[PDB]
Point group: C2
Chain length 225, copies 2
């Protein structure tokens, strides 16, 4: 089918949400290279700053699976979905009972430009007052490998995530995402997407945050050594 993805594409986003009842609004602008699976975004907290929780819990909601280097042999559910786009829904379950849900509706900017528009909602509850999220003791998310599999004509992606904590040790979170193209696209076989996402720059209270992600799809380890 016909793809409208180009090598250099812009990003605009707006996230509205609440974590333990604390409301916030964050906007962002960036750019990426969909075929190389790399992207950058500059974020600004416009309401609710200074955030009382670890900024790291929000970052995977900001940096869209269109920014993944998919090899020719693996069906690319994401790049096929444009210009109409796709949406995603995710649950992020932390080992201490804290839980976040997020959604993103990803479409093209109405002016016809090479720009993805992201409408994000983010909500979190049951974070303990003395946990690493509320005490802001996280350093970064480790790299990860998301497992992609078709279910009910849509694509699911599950990933074991871990936040490295200040002073050592990790804080685990299980992600379950459901991706839904806005038109019929070819469905992929079971596959993997390796990710490496990091905050590359931030101000003291995380009102200004710069994010970078590199992601690449694969079919796992071949049986022969």
């Amino acid at each position: 089918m016909v793809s409208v993805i180009t090598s250099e594409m812009k990003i605009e986003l707006r996230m509205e949400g609440a974590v333990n009842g604390h409301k916030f609004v964050i906007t962002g602008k960036g750019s990426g290279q969909p075929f190389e699976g790399i992207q950058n975004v500059d974020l600004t907290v416009i309401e609710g700053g200074p955030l009382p929780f670890a900024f790291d819990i929000l970052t995977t909601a900001f940096x869209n699976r269109v920014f993944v280097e998919y090899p020719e042999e693996i069906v690319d559910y994401f790049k096929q979905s444009f210009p109409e786009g796709y949406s995603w829904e995710r649950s992020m379950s932390y080992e201490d009972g804290g839980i976040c849900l997020a959604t993103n509706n990803i479409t093209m900017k109405k002016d016809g430009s090479n720009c993805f528009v992201n409408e994000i909602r983010f909500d979190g509850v049951n974070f303990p007052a003395n946990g690493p999220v509320m005490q802001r003791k996280t350093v970064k998310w480790e790299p990860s490998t998301e497992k992609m599999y078709v279910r009910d004509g849509v694509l699911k992606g599950d990933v074991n995530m871990a936040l490295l904590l200040q002073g050592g040790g990790h804080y685990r979170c299980d992600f379950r995402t459901t991706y839904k193209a806005k038109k019929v696209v070819q469905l992929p076989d079971y596959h993997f997407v390796d990710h490496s996402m990091e905050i590359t720059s931030h101000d003291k209270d995380y009102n200004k945050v710069k994010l970078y992600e590199h992601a690449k799809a694969h079919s796992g380890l071949p049986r022969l050594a």
Copy 2:
């Protein structure tokens, strides 16, 4: 420190367990190449055959993390632990509420030979009568990437697993393992172990099953494309 691992090592195992109250005993003999991360095992059900449940649920308990190609830059918790050895404990939680727990105590054969002895216990409950486990509708486990991280001076490994089902679709299971060396060893930083395990031969009722696994450790996707 001093490693006693050699390029060709033998395997002997005995699993005793129960799934939905059905008791069974299975023994196995095999061989592997620890540095190449590949191994084979020939299994025989000696009690409880024909098994009424999918043989696939047992296979990751049989095909020992010593059979992983660890690069020099990543600390190998497993190879350091010998000759004393190590044990593991695992929970395997299926999306339909079925759950299995397994343990393996891994030591060297008492005759001084280059042979790993595995004492395995396996227990499963709450599998629905019409699910793919009790109806034996599984095809294989997909390849996977296990996430390794230190916790309380021991090593944990978590992995999103999926059984491909007869007729298509996947049946998800979350593994949580805790590995415990029988002596002080150097602890690794956060890392990954890709696995690809498959039944290469079996008889009609799975009383005789041949298993092969290839596993290789890594540190995830580098940030630069």
